[PDB]
Amino acid sequence: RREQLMREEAEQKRLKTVLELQYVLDKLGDDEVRTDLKQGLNGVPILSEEELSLLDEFYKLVDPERDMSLRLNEQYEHASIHLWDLLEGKEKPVCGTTYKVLKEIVERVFQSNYFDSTHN
Amino acid sequence: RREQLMREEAEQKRLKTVLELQYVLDKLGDDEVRTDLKQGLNGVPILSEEELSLLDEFYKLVDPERDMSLRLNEQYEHASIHLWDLLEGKEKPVCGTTYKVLKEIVERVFQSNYFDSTHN
Incomplete structure (x- = not known):
């Protein structure tokens, strides 16, 4: 009963995290953003180029281009699972690494x- | 234990629905799409202009412009709740109507x- 409210909160918070992630992944398309992350603030990098490429590959998986052989209700089945696995930080393979590493x-x-x- | 697997499936399916919705809401920005929906196939409308405006208002709530007074971890708190409420089809007010009506x-x-x- 209160475990119900707790589960509902966790699901909402999970959606919030998804929205944040989508925002970030979208911004990773800006060259200026990529530059800023790879260098950091005072010389201390936020991302390596390698980690950045991992995010690019993941981006393709969770934001797929529309495939004409797929109906709308099918288009995002895989993406939904990729997103869920990332949030859970699963020890499962993806992008030549794991969701656990991607989550980190x-x-x-x-x-x-x-x-x-x-930054506009 | 199996209720665990069932809850995990429901959450993933919910994410899939969110992704579908985001795709649709994005396409509702195309004038040609809006035209096609308001007229329908053989004369039978999918959306009224009124319902279309309701979706436009909802779109603003779940895809907010970046507000400089908000940190990233705060930006999508409200949006996450709006999305969750829509999926649940709650009898709660939003956009001068209810999430139940929006879900329908x-x-x-x-x-x-x-x-x-x-359609490209």
């Missing part, structure tokens, strides 16, 4: 607070 | 199969 990367990006400022 | 609108759009074809 995302956490460092989130926690760097780079994206707490807006 | 989204279902009709999904089920029209308009978005089963790609």
Whole structure:
């Protein structure tokens, strides 16, 4: 009963994390953003180029281009699982690494607070 | 234990629905798409202009512009709740209507199969 409320909160918080992630992944398309992350603040990098490439590959998996052989209700089945696995930080293979490693990367990006400022 | 697997499946399926919804809401920015939905196939409308405006308002709530007074971890708190409430079809107020009514609108759009074809 209260475990119900707790599960509902966890699911909402999970959605919030998904939205944050989508925002970040979208911003990783900007060359200026990639530059800022690879160098860091005072010389201390947030991402290596290697980790950045891992995020690019993951980006393709969770934001797929529309495939004409797939109906709408099918298009995001795999993406939904990729997203869920990342949030859980699963010890499962993806992008030549694991969701656990990808989650650790995302956490460092989130926690760097780079994206707490807006940059237009 | 199996209720665990069932909850995990439901959460993944919920993410899939979110992704589908985001895709649709994004396409609702195309004037040609709006035209096609308001007229329908053989004269039978998928959306009224009124329902379309309801989706536009909801779009603003779940895809907010980046607000410089908000940190990244705060930006999508409200959006996450709006999304969750829609999925649950709650009898709660939003956009001068309810999430229950909005969910019914989204279902009709999904089920029209308009978005089963790609249109570029």
